């Protein structure tokens, strides 16, 4: 069950890492 | 700068066991202490970590 | 009354389970990683090796 | 201008030693989280 969490969590790493994209929309602002 | 990837990126699989607290508790225990066992393991098994704040900070 | 008189469970002999639960936990928080000896002055490093904990 | 020590703003990268360098005085500071995490969730209570 454990390996459930983990692969939940590991994505929610990337999606907040992408999430990096918007700084870049604010260097162009 | 090898070392500490591999140190991070270092793969964990052992087949974390699961536990029968019902067989232990039918083929001999402690009164009290298979229950106790259970009720206080269950409990840290809850905890997990943010992997939320970390993204955010580095 | 079998409860405890097929099990009797003495002070000491549940200790000795407390203490290995104990010496567990520091075994595991104490064990600091194990990379290059010689490589690994940083001062950022050996203060975090001095605090692991 | 002010925070690099060269003698030239005629820069040519031949190694990677200034790049490396930088790498592992960062990637490392980061170490200790997860052991730092661990202190926390089994400092919450004891299994006995």
Same mark, same amino acid.
């Given at each position: 069950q454990?390996?459930?969490?983990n692969?939940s969590k590991?994505?929610?790493?990337y999606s907040?890492?992408?999430?990096?994209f918007?700084?870049?929309?604010?260097?162009?602002? | 700068?090898?070392?500490?990837?591999?140190?991070?990126?270092? =793969?964990?699989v052992? =087949?974390?066991?699961?536990?029968?607290?019902?067989?232990?508790?039918?083929?001999?225990?402690? =009164?009290?202490?298979?229950?106790?066992?259970?009720?206080?393991?269950?409990?840290?098994?809850?905890?997990?970590y943010?992997?939320?704040?970390?993204?955010?900070?580095? | 009354?079998?409860?405890?008189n097929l #099990?009797?469970?003495?002070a000491?002999?549940?200790?000795?389970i407390?203490?290995? /639960?104990?010496? *567990?936990? &520091?075994?595991?928080?104490?064990?600091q990683? &194990?990379? /290059?000896?010689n490589?690994?002055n940083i001062?950022s490093?050996?203060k #975090?090796? *001095?605090?692991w904990? | +201008?002010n925070? @690099? %020590?060269?003698?030239?703003?005629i820069? @040519?990268?031949q190694? !990677? %030693?200034?790049m %490396?360098? %930088?790498?592992v005085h960062?990637?490392?500071?980061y @170490?200790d !989280?997860?052991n730092? +995490?661990? !202190?926390?969730?089994?400092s919450?209570?004891?299994? @006995?």
């Open positions: 454990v390996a459930q969490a692969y590991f994505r929610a790493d907040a890492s992408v999430a990096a918007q700084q870049r929309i604010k260097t162009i602002e | 700068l090898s070392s500490l990837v591999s140190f991070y990126n270092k =793969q964990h052992e =087949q974390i066991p699961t536990i029968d607290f019902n067989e232990w508790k039918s083929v001999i225990s402690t =009164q009290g202490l298979v229950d106790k066992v259970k009720e206080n393991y269950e409990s840290l098994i809850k905890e997990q943010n992997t939320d704040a970390i993204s955010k900070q580095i | 009354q079998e409860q405890a #099990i009797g469970l003495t000491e002999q549940l200790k000795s407390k203490e290995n /639960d104990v010496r *567990a936990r &520091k075994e595991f928080l104490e064990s990683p &194990k990379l /290059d000896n490589l690994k001062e490093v050996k #975090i090796l *001095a605090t904990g | +201008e925070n @690099i %020590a060269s003698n030239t703003y820069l @040519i990268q190694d !990677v %030693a200034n %490396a360098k %930088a790498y960062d990637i490392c500071g @170490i !989280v997860a730092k +995490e661990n !202190v926390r969730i089994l919450k209570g004891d299994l @006995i």
